[PDB]
Structure 1
Amino acid sequence: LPDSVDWREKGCVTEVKYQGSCGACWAFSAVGALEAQLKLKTGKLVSLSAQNLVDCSTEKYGNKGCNGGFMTTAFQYIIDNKGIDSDASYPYKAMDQKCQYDSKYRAATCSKYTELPYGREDVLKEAVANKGPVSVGVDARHPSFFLYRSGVYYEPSCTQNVNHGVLVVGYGDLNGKEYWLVKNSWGHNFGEEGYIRMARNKGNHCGIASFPSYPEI
């Protein structure tokens, strides 16, 4: 495997999104993973509708819209629904709404998804290198995560109990200190202009390898 990977260099990551006061992190994580697969399959980089997930991947999928949800059950909605709309046709409103999916605005499909084994950062590394960006949950319930500005993030009070959906778009090392490159959905001013580099091979730090998944078109 390569020592470092960055999927932004490969034209597979869209601009950073801003979830606002709506807990749609899981929707943004899910769409981000699919966006990479869509580029790999079709040649087009297109932001997909997180709002479509918030509004439509609801009770039947065990999701709670702006009060949280799962990337895995989001992918299964896209599979069952036979499509997801573009962000352009179904833009983000940071609120729970009635489902407004229309197949006339379909931008991607999903055929399957894969959930990686619990806590295996080596299996995660392999998937990031060979398959694409991987949706993950992290423990983001610490002020240090909010206040993060730069470098490799390490929080000694972090747990493996995950509560925030993000996307691993790469990995590497900062002067030997190994990290995962994570795309957040907290706007362009969070962390390193939307991104956080999180400690890698530090005992599943903040639960980053607790619940990884990726979709396929």
Structure 2
Amino acid sequence: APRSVDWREKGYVTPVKNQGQCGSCWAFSATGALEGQMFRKTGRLISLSEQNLVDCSGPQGNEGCNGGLMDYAFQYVQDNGGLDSEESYPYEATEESCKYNPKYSVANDTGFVDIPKQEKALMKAVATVGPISVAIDAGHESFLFYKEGIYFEPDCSSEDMDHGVLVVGYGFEDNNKYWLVKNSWGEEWGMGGYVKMAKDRRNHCGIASAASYPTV
């Protein structure tokens, strides 16, 4: 693989969004991964509707503003035959009735791939596929108040993840490697809404434990 990758530089990544006070991190992670794959497929970067996922993917197992899984989101898109644009189905940060309109569908998927649970496998996927949906342990104030540099938390769990985000690349700055991770907490958090998570340090915060992407 390349020594560094940043898919933002290749046009795969929309600006940082803000989930607000709704537990919809999973939906932002999923739209991020699908935005990347649709861009690879068509050459068009189109912002996708998290609200559509929040409101409509209950049958697949998601729980709206109370949490959910990226893979369940990808399954919804496949079952549903589409996903609306952000513009057509704007984000409200509350769970509402499903208002999917196929007229404004701009994305689809044909399934998803779960990446082997190792950082070497994750790097290979990031290098070859595009942005990757990932689960992390974000349940430390050190993450809440993260500002800059490589994030390293001695107490982080590699097995108990509670937050879905998007790996958009990787690189290096003694222990100087990182994953470039797009969050969904607005631009004023971290480095323009991004965090450099410690890479190749024993699967820190479980970043390789539940990584996936949609096929398109």
1:91 is matched with which residue?
Answer: 90
1:172 is matched with which residue?
Answer: 171
Please show how residues 60-75 of structure 1 align to structure 2 within 5 Å.
60-75=59-74
Q: Distance in 1 between matches of 2:154 and 2:11?
A: 34
How many residues are matched? 215
Per the TM alignment, residue 34 of structure 1 is displaced from its structure 2 partner at its CA by 0.4
2:145 is matched with which residue?
Answer: 147
Instruction: Tell me which stretches of 4 or more aligned residues in structure 1 moved more than 3 Å.
Output: none
2:36 is matched with which residue?
Answer: 36
Q: What amino acid is the match of 1:174?
A: E
Q: Distance in 1 between matches of 2:156 and 2:129?
A: 28
Residue deviations 1:52-84 (CA, integer Å, cap 9, x gap):
0000011x2111100100000100000000000
1:8 is matched with which residue?
Answer: 8
Q: Distance in 2 between matches of 1:62 and 1:39?
A: 27
Q: Distance in 1 between matches of 2:213 and 2:11?
A: 18
Per the TM alignment, residue 216 of structure 1 is displaced from its structure 2 partner at its CA by 1.6
Residue deviations 1:132-152 (CA, integer Å, cap 9, x gap):
110000000000001101010
2:50 is matched with which residue?
Answer: 50
1:78 is matched with which residue?
Answer: 77
Per the TM alignment, residue 176 of structure 1 is displaced from its structure 2 partner at its CA by 6.0
Residue deviations 1:158-203 (CA, integer Å, cap 9, x gap):
0121000000000001186000000000001110011000000000
**3-state SS, counterpart of residue 52 of structure 2:** helix
Q: Distance in 2 between matches of 1:67 and 1:187?
A: 19
Residue deviations 1:13-58 (CA, integer Å, cap 9, x gap):
0010000000110000000000011111111111100100000011
Q: What amino acid is the match of 1:54?
A: V
Q: What amino acid is the match of 1:199?
A: A
Q: Distance in 2 between matches of 1:22 and 1:102?
A: 23
**3-state SS, counterpart of residue 29 of structure 1:** helix
* Aligned residues: CA RMSD: 0.9
Please show how residues 149-164 of structure 1 align to structure 2 within 5 Å.
149-160=147-158, 161-164=160-163
**3-state SS, counterpart of residue 113 of structure 1:** strand
**3-state SS, counterpart of residue 93 of structure 2:** coil
Q: Does 1:127 align with 2:125?
A: yes
Per the TM alignment, residue 109 of structure 1 is displaced from its structure 2 partner at its CA by 0.5
**3-state SS, counterpart of residue 61 of structure 1:** coil
Q: What amino acid is the match of 2:186?
A: G
2:24 is matched with which residue?
Answer: 24
Which residues of structure 2 form unaligned runs of 5+?
none
Q: Distance in 1 between matches of 2:90 and 2:200?
A: 37
Per the TM alignment, residue 117 of structure 1 is displaced from its structure 2 partner at its CA by 1.7
Q: What amino acid is the match of 1:178?
A: K
Q: Distance in 2 between matches of 1:209 and 1:176?
A: 18
Identity of aligned residues (%): 57
